[PDB]
Amino acid sequence: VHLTPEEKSAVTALWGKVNVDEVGGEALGRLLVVYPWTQRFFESFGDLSTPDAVMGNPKVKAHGKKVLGAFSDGLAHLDNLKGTFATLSELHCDKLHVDPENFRLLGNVLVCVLAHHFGKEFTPPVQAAYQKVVAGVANALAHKYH
Amino acid sequence: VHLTPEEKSAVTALWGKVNVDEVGGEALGRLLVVYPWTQRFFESFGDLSTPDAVMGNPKVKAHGKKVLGAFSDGLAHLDNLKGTFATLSELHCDKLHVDPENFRLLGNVLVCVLAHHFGKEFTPPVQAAYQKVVAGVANALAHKYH
Amino acid sequence: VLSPADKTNVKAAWGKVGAHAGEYGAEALERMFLSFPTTKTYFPHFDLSHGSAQVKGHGKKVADALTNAVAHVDDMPNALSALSDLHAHKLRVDPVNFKLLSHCLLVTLAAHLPAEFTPAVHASLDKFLASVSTVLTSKYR
Amino acid sequence: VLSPADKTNVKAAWGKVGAHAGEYGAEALERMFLSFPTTKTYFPHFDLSHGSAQVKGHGKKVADALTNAVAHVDDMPNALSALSDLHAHKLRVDPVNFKLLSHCLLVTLAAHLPAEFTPAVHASLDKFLASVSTVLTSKYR
């Protein structure tokens, strides 16, 4: 993290308009649809075979809410982006063995979902800051492959 | 890094048989040949157009020696793998703008070159430790994209 | 691969992108240059600035080549050939950059087309671009 | 793409790998399972242990499918089809794993064939495997 004072603000002033409950699951839904190998990990979940049945999965919307949760814990605790996630990193790496590049895919689709919802106010320099937050959050979860 | 006592030894007991002067350049040579976009960065160098003219480039063998050098600085200073490379990271990231995944390619071909030279004594668990060192060295150079 | 129906989501999503394709291809350069600064290496002769006529002029080119992939999609290899020799022989673009531009491009379809941009179409557009990049890197392989 | 002469380095390098192909395909599984443990997820029904008859039996399969790519190389799509539905529909292997197995496979050609394994052939073999993986992931795209 660095987040120049003028990046920090564009990021902070987006999130407060974010309907976490219904964005977290637009993202986790899009993840299983665009990158289907991720479905392997969610077979505890139900019917994931056609894109409608995912975006309308009460589970997929439930779990996603936990996920915008930990982006919230990151988006404003950026000082140790590493330390807020230690346990989750322990959960994703040496428990579920999710390869680190999925961590980038998820943050990337999150950005597509941030763009999809906010349209023109997701201006390029306001994107450029989110690619920094996301890349950081993704370097943090992956800290236990070392 | 972790390097369990029994990994640490297989790694340390390979390197001392390593002819640094002529391995560093087998690797940097193989890099420009198998992954040619890297050539963009070495146009200060000379003829790189056919694979023979690279493996016999006095420059390509010279520069590679600096590179097995910084693996040597890593292979036995593993405690801060981050700190031995700060300046080099500053050199590769925000000076030459080399994308971080080339850092993995280079360590990967280094392993192909370690295997090529030592044959059967490059047993799988003795490889498995080098993929840890290399991945670490590659996480370290890239520390300034954050 | 690029199924009968992915071929349909792309011919449609680009269908309503129409008139704007050139503004969009340039918005997505601006996004790539901003977010992933390691790509600026290749355009030292551009003003990588917001108003820049060069990036705005190049948006037209990237958008022209995307169109000539949307139409001829059942045969990308032949159509995109000279761009798959320019990027791969002449320029030597690191193929990881193609992933990034594909991503900014999607963040641009998203930010301008919310109703089209259904999850299935996000998949199709991604599958489309993943094929454009595969074509663009095929001298490499 | 897979030029007239890359097609020649692979038909030759595999040529002298002959009798051993099955031992080698199994050595490279062992290497992948060891070095990149995140791949063990897919073989919970294997003894991912060194002597394991399953990994040794599977080495034969991976090596059989590589051969049936070396021969028919001018047409990977058609030949590898049912493995490009097994891995991509049935199994859902993360395509980043294909890069890793390709790498262990090269560390195995290297460790057993030093004189063949000239820098040009390292390139060819890599280009070959990059096409096998591209075929193996093509339902995905």
Ligand code: HEM
């Ligand atoms: C920014 C990236 C990610 C964040 C912040 C995140 C966050 C979380 C959180 C908060 C949980 C639940 C924590 C708890 O139960 O208390 C979780 C669980 C899980 N995540 Fe992620 N995740 C991320 C990426 C991924 C990716 C890429 C995958 C790959 C498919 C994944 C797969 C899973 C699975 C399978 C679980 C199941 C939890 C369980 O054991 O019940 N996650 N994640």
Ligand code: HEM
């Ligand atoms: C393990 C990974 C790597 C290590 C340890 C390494 C090490 C080095 C060292 C020691 C130097 C010279 C330091 C000095 O001049 O005092 C250097 C220079 C350089 N490296 Fe790397 N390198 C690595 C990966 C890469 C990669 C992947 C590229 C991409 C092509 C690259 C491109 C360069 C270039 C172009 C220079 C020129 C130095 C100059 O400005 O004169 N390096 N590297």
Ligand code: HEM
């Ligand atoms: C969707 C993928 C892409 C498409 C369709 C595309 C298309 C094009 C086209 C049509 C041209 C000019 C054609 C001509 O003048 O004959 C071009 C030029 C160029 N492209 Fe791309 N491109 C893509 C991705 C990239 C990426 C990722 C880079 C990253 C460096 C890149 C770097 C360049 C450069 C440096 C030029 C030349 C600029 C100049 O010297 O005028 N392209 N591209």
Ligand code: HEM
């Ligand atoms: C060079 C690339 C690869 C080739 C040529 C290859 C080939 C094969 C073949 C021929 C089979 C069995 C065919 C049959 O029984 O009909 C198979 C099965 C399988 N492959 Fe691969 N494979 C490759 C890479 C991978 C990778 C990277 C993974 C990573 C998870 C993987 C996971 C599997 C699994 C899980 C099975 C089934 C094992 C079982 O249930 O018996 N393969 N592969």
